[PDB]
Design a protein around this ligand. Structure first.
Ligand SMILES: Nc1nc2c(ncn2[C@@H]2O[C@H](COP(=O)(O)OP(=O)(O)OP(=O)(O)O)[C@@H](O)[C@H]2O)c(=O)[nH]1
Ligand SMILES: Nc1nc2c(ncn2[C@@H]2O[C@H](COP(=O)(O)OP(=O)(O)OP(=O)(O)O)[C@@H](O)[C@H]2O)c(=O)[nH]1
Ligand SMILES: Nc1nc2c(ncn2[C@@H]2O[C@H](COP(=O)(O)OP(=O)(O)OP(=O)(O)O)[C@@H](O)[C@H]2O)c(=O)[nH]1
Ligand SMILES: Nc1ncnc2c1ncn2[C@@H]1O[C@H](COP(=O)(O)OP(=O)(O)OP(=O)(O)O)[C@@H](O)[C@H]1O
Ligand SMILES: Nc1ncnc2c1ncn2[C@@H]1O[C@H](COP(=O)(O)OP(=O)(O)OP(=O)(O)O)[C@@H](O)[C@H]1O
Ligand SMILES: Nc1ncnc2c1ncn2[C@@H]1O[C@H](COP(=O)(O)OP(=O)(O)OP(=O)(O)O)[C@@H](O)[C@H]1O
Lengths: 248, 248, 248
């Protein structure tokens, strides 16, 4: 005898490796492929809650003020005091917690999409603590289209995902949050027109969700992001992901 | 320069105020606007759980027997005994709780929609304790269309919302509950036909939800309803809401 | 005369009984009828979690690794240790629980549909512990169509439901799970084309859900399955259900 490895056009092992990676990249971008969304809530103790949803055609996550708060499973969370925090955040002077600022409040949110999203379809409702998009329902558009703010996460010249990050450093940064994006579809075949619409309804049923609180960004990077070939952007602006298209 | 306030057609401050209010009322009723649903569960201790959802195009809430039960966050809820209540309510003589009637059972339900709902589209599945609409699945239509029972909440001659209220005073009033309504659309443009269908799918992702148990109706009126310009109807048939159209 | 019972074509009581049963069977199969899905998670202590959803047009259930785990309401569940189990199952050697195998892990899953499902529409995402269908998102089709594996549950010659059962006997059988099916529609009228599409969106709102952990299969058979005329298949391959069509 056979040709020698890495010297000719008959390194079929090499060609197959490149195709395997290209096939995965392009399958993900096909209408048969996943589109995925991660919402990361960063807490002052360094821990990070991730909410993930993976689905065909479109994907979303919807959270309220309470559901974004840090919960340390199987440890003390002062649940009564934190309900009083909630009452005090839903209306000023509306509660009697033993604290001014709950350390269970997120300090920042990172939204990441898989590279298979179309950024023009991204929608976000970053609402107030009682789940209104813009102060009062009567004046609220139920979302903002924020795609232009999404940064490409590049690795080795390939877009491995998209990130929108915003800090919540101020005491009044008390939010509810929903996010939605639609899978790429450069064809003119509408996946939700009658020929395929019921499948999109089924995709709502079939969407897989994951949630966990990791003790720190290092642990998240190591045992979640890297383990499962997900894209990420850390606090030092370091990009993580696996470039696949046309690559060995 | 200038004319004197409140004496001529050049009180532009006055005209702008009236337009600001009219714009909010009419924006809410546009296809860009919210439709909102509140389900209030009233408990014997005077507290009130609210479940709220705010979304474009259509909105709904789905609860089971268990999820409607009173939960006092961070206080004693006798969770084992209340699981035995559940077993005893799912099937007669099916549990061994230390009580005949759980005070965590709702005594009444009020369903309120924003004025932007079309009442003809309202659907409710008030089912039994195991989440069947009408005793057995084989004979169950999955909803009832109850719009004709909805009372207008009028303030200053304007409809600020719609209410359907039913008490659960009897021991056998053990329910599951889902409710759905569609945003007004007097146009013939179908928001869920192919030109806009994927946006309606995204609205399912983007819908914002809120839940809280207020200690009493007074507190709910003060720190939830009134604070956020929501419609309400209290036990004394008093109407709450903010009239906007054509008004200063 | 009157004729004597059970001797002539004028036993109208008999004819009405047969029609009542036939009407229920056939109503369930009409587009006005329910389609229902049950996911049973079997634990080593003999208890069984059921997740049920009942809805018009289509129905689904989506669970993650954590949500399928046994929770004994109001009893000790060692929540910190079980969070460490989760960390250790999401990534090998990723936690520090006091055990090798959590007895809260399901030992098997049974998926049952009502007889009103079309088995060709059934879709399942049996994913890994972090909610990816097939190891990595890039290579994952978001479901498998498993209808050919569904066994008919026959009683008295009638199909009363469909079952797909799989054991999780191995230590590596750590899963996430979503399942979806569409209600029979032998007509060519698309329930999700524009004439009726918004109603299918409302059905997503209106779907009723039920969850409970029964202490054993006997109790489930007695107080859930049999009580509510649901189909079932027990560990000894015994079929349960109520035959209705053309029957008294
Ligand atoms: N492209 C390129 N890579 C370099 C160069 N010098 C060092 N490198 C390293 O080599 C890596 C790329 O190697 P290859 O993947 O085999 O080069 P390629 O350009 O992708 O060529 P093909 O994969 O054969 O199409 C990069 O990640 C660099 O870190 C250089 O001059 N050009
Ligand atoms: N319309 C009306 N309001 C009265 C009358 N007497 C007292 N009021 C009070 O005045 C309020 C309405 O005042 P306005 O809003 O300025 O009157 P309006 O009829 O709405 O007239 P415009 O807003 O200028 O179109 C009501 O809420 C009443 O409580 C009356 O005779 N007619
Ligand atoms: N069909 C049938 N059933 C039998 C026979 N012998 C005993 N059985 C029992 O009788 C039951 C059926 O009785 P029926 O429902 O009145 O008989 P059928 O065949 O359904 O007749 P129709 O309901 O009048 O149309 C079955 O469940 C059997 O357990 C037999 O020879 N033929
Ligand atoms: N020294 C080099 N000279 C020329 N081309 C390079 C070199 N290093 C990498 N490349 C190529 O340039 C392209 C971009 O790779 P690069 O490593 O810059 O991506 P990146 O990970 O986004 O970089 P960075 O994260 O440092 O901004 C790839 O096709 C890669 O093969
Ligand atoms: N004394 C009055 N004489 C004439 N018109 C009035 C008077 N008070 C209010 N109105 C007008 O009548 C219309 C209805 O207002 P009204 O206060 O009756 O509404 P409402 O809040 O539903 O009343 P209620 O709650 O007492 O049934 C409004 O346009 C208002 O400006
Ligand atoms: N002894 C019998 N002789 C003839 N027909 C019978 C007899 N028993 C039942 N049947 C009929 O045969 C058909 C199938 O009934 P059968 O009891 O076999 O269904 P099944 O409950 O699926 O049976 P199994 O569970 O034992 O496999 C029905 O129409 C029934 O009336």
């Amino acid at each position: 005898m056979a040709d020698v490895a890495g010297t000719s056009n008959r390194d079929f092992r090499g060609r197959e490796q490149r195709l395997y990676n290209s096939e995965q990249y392009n399958y993900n971008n096909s209408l048969n492929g996943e589109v995925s969304l991660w919402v990361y809530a960063y807490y002052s103790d360094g821990s990070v809650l991730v909410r993930n949803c993976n689905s065909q055609y479109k994907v979303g996550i919807s959270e309220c003020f309470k559901s974004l708060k840090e919960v340390r499973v199987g440890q003390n969370n002062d649940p009564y005091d934190e309900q009083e925090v909630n009452n005090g955040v839903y209306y000023p002077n509306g509660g009697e917690p033993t604290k001014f600022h709950s350390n269970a409040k997120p300090r920042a949110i990172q939204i990441i999409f898989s590279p298979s999203v179309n950024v023009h379809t991204i929608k976000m409702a970053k609402g107030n603590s009682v789940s209104i998009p813009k102060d009062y329902l009567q004046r609220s558009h139920p979302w903002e289209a924020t795609g232009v703010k999404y940064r490409k996460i590049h690795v080795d010249g390939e877009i491995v995902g998209y990130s929108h990050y915003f800090e919540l450093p101020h005491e009044y940064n008390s939010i509810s949050l929903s996010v939605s994006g639609v899978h790429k579809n450069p064809s003119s075949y509408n996946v939700a027109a009658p020929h395929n619409i019921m499948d999109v309804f089924q995709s709502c049923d079939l969407a897989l969700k994951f949630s966990n609180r990791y003790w720190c960004e290092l642990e998240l990077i190591n045992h979640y992001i890297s383990a499962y070939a997900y894209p990420y952007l850390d606090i030092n602006n370091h990009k993580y992901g696996v470039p696949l298209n046309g690559r060995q």
